[PDB]
Write a protein that binds this DNA or RNA. Structure first.
Ligand SMILES: [Mg+2]
Ligand SMILES: [Mg+2]
Ligand SMILES: [Mg+2]
Ligand SMILES: [Mg+2]
Ligand SMILES: [Mg+2]
Ligand SMILES: [Mg+2]
Ligand SMILES: [Mg+2]
Ligand SMILES: [Mg+2]
Ligand SMILES: [Mg+2]
Ligand SMILES: [Mg+2]
Ligand SMILES: [Mg+2]
Ligand SMILES: [Mg+2]
Ligand SMILES: [Mg+2]
Ligand SMILES: [Mg+2]
Ligand SMILES: [Mg+2]
Ligand SMILES: [Mg+2]
Ligand SMILES: [Mg+2]
Ligand SMILES: [Mg+2]
Ligand SMILES: [Mg+2]
Ligand SMILES: [Mg+2]
Ligand SMILES: [Zn+2]
Lengths: 146, 58, 174, 37, 213
RNA sequence: ACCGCUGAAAGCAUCUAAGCGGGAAACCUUCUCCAAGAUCAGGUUUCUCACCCACUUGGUGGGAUAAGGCCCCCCGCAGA
RNA sequence: CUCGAUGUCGGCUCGUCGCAUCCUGGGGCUGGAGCAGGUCCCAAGGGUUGGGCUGUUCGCCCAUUAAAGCGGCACGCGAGC
């Protein structure tokens, strides 16, 4: 039978991604794949493989000006007329890490396992992170030539 | 695909190169090999890469 | 045909180049500027200003004229600052010099006071004539427009604040 | 400012321009100025 | 520059001013307060000062609270509350162990009084939200105080959140704005505040200088 | 919405394509209230800070406690 | 679609949403002297009365008001009247 990962089989590592000029979608896809563990040959869709991901410089991500001016973020509180909208520009002014985190979470499978997968994600706006005790190796986006 | 991209090649070209080299190893056994003998998988990658044509876009 | 024209340099005391940025000095203060990336500002045999750009491109041809006119205005201002002469029309309408600010009497209950921004000089010659001077053309024009719009247009009687010698529309009314 | 889907100059001094993605006609006569909408 | 004090609502009376007008006043016993603690930005993230008010027997205070009071070196009180200052902490005008009295206010000033409104129990819609009810005659059948309709129809097949209905009422925290301090009595330490103050007689009340004035 | 400053492409002009302003009971802060079940379940503090038995010795079963709390009791303008 | 049942007008009670804006807010033009208007653009935060006649909706009228807006929600709402 094909290999099925057991408890204790999976191993985790720490990655730090600098988002100083990466496009938001590119960075989100890379982080989502790293979190899920699709880069490992031991991957199984029912097992939370994958590694911890730290994103720094979340305020420096690359977004177009028209997107900053026109892309909406919606929320409904549940009350009548409870729809609240903010632009990506205001969101980046206030909580830049939330824009990145929302983009990443939109790209994970919509099931229970993603709730446990996303616990390994840390997004910081500045160039510093508190997890120096762990040793996050830097990760850069690469494209395998075809 | 995970193992191929680990060895820096796409699934596309790995399959095409294995077909060109005439290796008829199954996908099931290819995945088993990828998990169990990474050195053997690497050797298969070099074989497929060699069998690939000089320019894949012509 | 603007942009393919060198800029004469009367003084150019401290013309410097640092990554599409320039600064100039002379008889007046210094003002910094950053050039657009596709447009290059270069020095010539007698130190003139020339703007270069990769030809045959819409976004480059458009930026060429802007890059030339910006630096020409900069050197013109550093040599002699820009001054605007505007007058006041209307019965009893007048302006007064109150220290550094200007006090206006345009028929309002309250006294209208305009505070002079940094780098801008105000001068009153006559009770209904006054000057706004400065180095930066854009700032001088902005303050002049602010002062000009102190009153709504009046085609019937013409009372308000006007630039010197400009023609405003008129209507018969009654 | 007249607002109609069809804007075209009325007199010889009306200038047809396009600013901020808006096709509009400017002229010295204030009652001649229009914009598309 | 907000000032604040804890006190007890003593009840209402009436008084006359210089223009010989009657002034309905609420008497508040703005008792002596001790601070016991300062909230600094560098240590908590905000600026505020604790306030201790109310005489209590030391036998009635458990060991943790007793230790908290011991650390600040003051005798335990009954109530403990924080006056949220502005971001301009200034790290001064308040030392641990300082006493505040009623003379921090003055005649003619304005204050904000916060308290806990009296409890009303389970209250119907007419009392709780001023619903009109239905008619008492002309054929009405047992709907004299009933709400009536609470929604539409198949579109939408639900009741929206926040619809006004019957339920528990009162016991809320309430603040009243811009109350004139008619007079401060220094000897007995009370404030004569013109108007009504939330809560019952004997309830704890916090008095603050009005932000709007 | 509208009103502009600087300004070429297009030697002029142009609120605009670079840029910079003003601008409403609309929007966001500011005032009032709820709020960490905010499962990312926070912060500042203070108190106890301690035992015994069994066992396959187990992040195991029990028992006895500290700080503290609850029930019982006398009541409330707190309340089905 | 509903015939082995989907209760039909008007009113009351409770609402909620849209803006094609009635008032309040901001403007352009005017055959806009001023007061007042007309027309067009932006704007939905709040507000938008009480009676006479009629089963009425609608409509006419009385007295006010800053104003007495237009619509959707099973022509909202009868296991609420
Ligand atoms: Mg009644
Ligand atoms: Mg009946
Ligand atoms: Mg009955
Ligand atoms: Mg009855
Ligand atoms: Mg529904
Ligand atoms: Mg111009
Ligand atoms: Mg039928
Ligand atoms: Mg039948
Ligand atoms: Mg049936
Ligand atoms: Mg309605
Ligand atoms: Mg509209
Ligand atoms: Mg007239
Ligand atoms: Mg008008
Ligand atoms: Mg509205
Ligand atoms: Mg608002
Ligand atoms: Mg109906
Ligand atoms: Mg019925
Ligand atoms: Mg029904
Ligand atoms: Mg009915
Ligand atoms: Mg029903
Ligand atoms: Zn014209």
């Amino acid at each position: 039978p094909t290999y099925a990962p057991k408890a204790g089989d999976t191993t985790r590592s720490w990655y730090v991604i600098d988002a100083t000029d990466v496009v938001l979608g590119r960075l989100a896809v890379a982080a989502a794949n790293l979190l899920r563990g699709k880069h490992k040959p031991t991957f199984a869709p029912n097992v939370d493989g994958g590694d911890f991901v730290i994103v720094i410089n979340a305020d420096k991500v690359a977004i177009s000006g028209d997107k900053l001016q026109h892309k909406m973020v919606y929320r409904h509180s549940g009350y009548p007329g409870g729809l609240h909208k903010r632009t990506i520009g205001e969101l980046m002014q206030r909580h830049p890490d939330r824009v990145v985190e929302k983009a990443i979470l939109g790209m994970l499978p919509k099931n229970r396992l993603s709730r446990q997968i996303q616990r390994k994600l840390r997004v910081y706006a500045g160039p510093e992170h508190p997890h120096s005790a762990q040793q996050p190796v830097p990760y850069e986006l690469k494209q395998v030539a075809q | 695909n995970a193992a191929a991209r680990l060895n820096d090649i796409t699934y596309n070209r790995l399959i095409q190169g294995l077909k060109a080299a005439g290796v008829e190893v199954d996908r099931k056994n290819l995945a088993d090999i990828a998990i169990s003998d990474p050195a053997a998988f690497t050797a298969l990658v070099d074989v497929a890469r060699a069998a690939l044509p000089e320019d894949v876009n012509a | 045909r603007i942009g393919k024209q060198p800029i004469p340099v009367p003084a150019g005391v401290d013309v410097t180049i640092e990554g599409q940025s320039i600064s100039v000095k002379g008889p007046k203060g210094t003002l910094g500027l950053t050039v657009a990336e596709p447009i290059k500002v270069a020095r010539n045999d007698d130190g003139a200003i020339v703007v270069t750009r990769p030809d045959d491109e819409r976004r480059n041809r458009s930026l060429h004229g802007l890059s030339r006119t910006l630096v020409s205005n900069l050197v013109t201002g550093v040599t002699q600052g820009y001054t605007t002469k505007m007058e006041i029309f209307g019965v009893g309408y007048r302006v007064q010099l109150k220290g550094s600010n200007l006090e206006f009497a345009l028929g309002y209950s309250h006294p209208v006071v305009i505070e002079a921004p940094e780098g801008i000089t105000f001068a009153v010659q006559a009770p209904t004539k006054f000057t706004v001077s400065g180095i930066d053309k854009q700032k001088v024009g902005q303050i002049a427009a602010n002062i000009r719009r102190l009153r709504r247009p009046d085609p019937y009687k013409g009372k308000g604040v006007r630039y010197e010698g400009e023609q405003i529309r008129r209507k018969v009314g009654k | 400012v007249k607002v109609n889907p069809s804007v075209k100059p009325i007199c010889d001094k009306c200038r047809l321009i396009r600013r901020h993605g808006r096709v509009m006609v400017i002229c010295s006569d204030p009652r001649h100025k229009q914009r598309q909408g | 520059a907000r000032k604040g004090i804890l006190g007890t609502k003593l009840g209402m009376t009436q008084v006359f001013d210089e223009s010989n007008r009657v002034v309905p006043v609420t008497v508040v016993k703005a008792g002596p307060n001790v601070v016991t603690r300062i909230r600094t930005p560098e240590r908590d993230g905000y600026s505020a000062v604790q306030l201790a008010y109310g005489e209590i027997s030391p036998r009635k205070v458990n060991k943790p609270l007793t230790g908290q009071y011991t650390a600040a070196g003051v005798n335990p009180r009954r109530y403990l509350a924080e006056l949220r200052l502005d971001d301009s902490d200034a790290a001064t005008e308040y030392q641990v162990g300082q006493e505040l009295t009623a003379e921090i206010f003055a005649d003619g000033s304005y204050v904000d009084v916060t308290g806990t409104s009296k409890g009303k129990g389970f209250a119907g819609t007419m009392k709780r939200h001023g619903f009109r009810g239905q008619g008492a005659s002309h054929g009405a059948q047992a709907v004299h105080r009933r709400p009536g309709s609470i929604g539409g129809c198949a579109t939408p097949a639900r009741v929206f959140k926040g619809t006004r209905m019957a339920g528990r009422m009162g016991n809320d925290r309430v603040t009243v704005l811009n109350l004139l301090v008619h007079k401060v009595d220094a000897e007995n330490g009370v404030l004569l505040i013109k108007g009504a103050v939330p809560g019952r007689t004997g309830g704890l009340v916090m008095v603050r200088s009005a932000i709007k004035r």
